[PDB]
Amino acid sequence: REPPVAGGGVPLLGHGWRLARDPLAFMSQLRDHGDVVRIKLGPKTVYAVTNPELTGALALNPDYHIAGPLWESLEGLLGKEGVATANGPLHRRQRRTIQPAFRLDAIPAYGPIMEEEAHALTERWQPGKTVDATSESFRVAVRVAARCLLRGQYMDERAERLCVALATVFRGLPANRRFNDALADLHLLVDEIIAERRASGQKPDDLLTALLEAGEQEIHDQVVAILTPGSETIASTIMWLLQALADHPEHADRIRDEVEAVTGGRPVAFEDVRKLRHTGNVIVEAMRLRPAVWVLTRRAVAESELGGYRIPAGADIIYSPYAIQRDPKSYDDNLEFDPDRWLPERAANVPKYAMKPFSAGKRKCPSDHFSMAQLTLITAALATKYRFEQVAGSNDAVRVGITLRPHDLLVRPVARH
Ligand code: HEM
Ligand SMILES: CC1=C2CC[C@H](C)[C@]23CC[C@@H](C3)C1(C)C
Ligand SMILES: CC1=C2CC[C@H](C)[C@]23CC[C@@H](C3)C1(C)C
């Protein structure tokens, strides 16, 4: 048993500084300091795990509750700020309720709405007019998510707006003015929306009905908790996908050939996605280099041992899938965009947990199936009808926030055939 090694920072704010000047680099640097190192952001210490294996151990071990200190500092506030009181403490139990709505079985029924949201974009974006990625990706997001996870009365541009005016408050404890007119409205709306399905919610397999079949304000809190993160994430995701279709014409058109073969001409549909291999490979390779979620935290319940190191109980640990997915030691062409490094042969070349956009423990992403489905749909629909090109002056330099998104990605759909 050996306690972790330290890294290197300043007085009152140890690593709290290097991290400040550039988080993403600090996560990657930390990789060589030891399999698990200790770092100090000011007075308190956290532990970082920089090895795929230990990070998988880390997720697959039920001994790590997720108060995760530089997450629950906001989650204690998310107890008013967002989600509401908590988020998956223990028991879970009253939380398997969610699985039935996100399983591989309940996604093909969302398929139509998914197809519909995609092709719609397709007529929405027209060649020549640059697409505003931040405002627009954030939209198909809401729409898809809300529209499949709830059905009937449309929250259309109303839900979007609020979350928008919302998401922007985070970048640059809670806030000042219009973030207000958006919040109450976000809650005003979610409630109003629970009230309505109460009418005739028969077959609705979505999350709302299953959530109406398991607390009074506990439902108004679990939707606002599932809909919130999952949207900004499927969004940031979309964003990097746009940069992808615009940055590697090759695969973009390659993605258009794959779609035509299988689809023939008919607009892409859930059945097809399950066929479009290259379409998903693109989506994955992109998510590896530019994930939306780049750090993940936990809070040990019991004094642990990891990679032979002693993890003090009650401790607070942190890891970076960002870094992991971009670790040389884990990948050959470390920074090379290559949708084909996911080819069966090279695929096994890559460590077990060196690529898991979502995680493995019960703190996993219920929409793994749900996401890739709408993303693959959305990737295929766009690449097929267009070809994306990035407006000069476009700013695709990363902005490190809740998730990793492009400060100002500007692209123009061009007409393909
Ligand atoms: C852009 C694709 C997505 C990625 C990469 C992703 C990733 C993740 C990760 C890494 C976690 C939690 C890991 C942890 O703390 O242990 C998570 C949790 C979660 N995600 Fe996603 N997600 C995506 C899309 C979505 C969507 C579309 C929804 C639903 C609208 C969603 C809903 C959730 C929920 C409710 C949780 C909390 C799980 C828990 O309490 O353990 N996610 N996601
Ligand atoms: C201030 C901040 C954080 C608090 C800890 C949490 C992991 C993070 C680490 C860097 C990200 C997320 C930002 C900049 C949003
Ligand atoms: C994956 C993820 C989340 C799951 C829900 C939780 C509130 C969040 C919402 C966005 C933040 C925290 C990140 C991106 C780390």
From 131, 159, 126, select the one nearest 143 (Cα to Cα): 159
Q: Which of 130, 158, 129 is nearest to 142 (CA)?
A: 158
Of the candidates 386, 357, 184, the one whose C-alpha atom is nearest the C-alpha of residue 280 is 357
215 near 86, Cβ under 8 Å? Answer: no
Rounded to whole angstroms, the Cα distance separating 70 from 201 reads 39
Q: How many helices (H) and strands (E) does the chain have?
A: 17, 13
Resolution (A): 3.3
Ligand nearest the Cα of residue 233 is 1
Amino acid at 139: R
Dihedral angle of Cα 303, 326, 14, 171, to the nearest 10 degrees: -110
Distance in angstroms (rounded) separating the CA atoms of residues 15 and 398:
21
Q: Copy the structure tokens of residue 69.
A: 């200190």
Can you say whether residue 381 is alpha, beta or left, with left for phi > 0 and alpha for psi between -120 and 50 degrees?
alpha
Instruction: Check pocket membership of 227 for ligand 1, CB cut-off 6 A.
Output: yes
In whole angstroms, what is the distance from residue 234 CA to residue 114 CA?
Answer: 13
What atom of ligand 1 comes closest to residue 95's alpha carbon? 40
Mutation to probe ligand 3, out of 75, 170, 226, 233 (largest number of atoms < 8 A from CB):
233
- What is the 3-state secondary structure of 209-222? HHCCCCCCCCHHHH
After which residues does the chain break, using C–N > 2.5 Å? 172, 214
Segments making up each domain of the chain, as ranges? 1-417
**CATH entry 1.10.630.10 includes domain 1-417:** yes
Is residue 28 classed as helix, strand or coil in its secondary structure? Answer: helix
Torsion of CA 368, 369, 372, 376, to 10 degrees: 180
Q: 70 CB less than 6 Å from ligand 2? A: yes
Q: What is the C-alpha to C-alpha distance for residues 189 and 291, in angstroms, rounded to an integer?
A: 30
Q: Are the CB atoms for 55 and 27 separated by under 8 Å?
A: no
Q: Is 371 in the pocket of ligand 3 (CB under 6 A)?
A: no
Which parts of 214-256 are beta strand (E)? none
Degrees, nearest 5: CA angle 111-371-77: 125
Position 406: which residue type? P
163 is in an annotated binding site: no
Is 384:416 a contact under the CB 8 Å cutoff?
Answer: yes
Q: Is the CB of 145 under 6 A from ligand 2?
A: no
User: Of 117, 121, 128, 115, which Cα lies nearest the Cα of 388?
Assistant: 128
Closest-CA residue to 369 (of 102, 95, 101): 102
Counting atoms of ligand 2 from 1, which one is nearest the CA of 400? 14
Residue 262: its H or E element = helix 249-263
Pairing verdict, β 309-311 and 304-306? antiparallel
Helices 277-289 and 219-247 pack at an angle, to 10 degrees, of: 100
Residues constituting the chain? 417
Experimental method: X-ray
CA distance linking residue 194 with residue 149, whole number of Å: 12
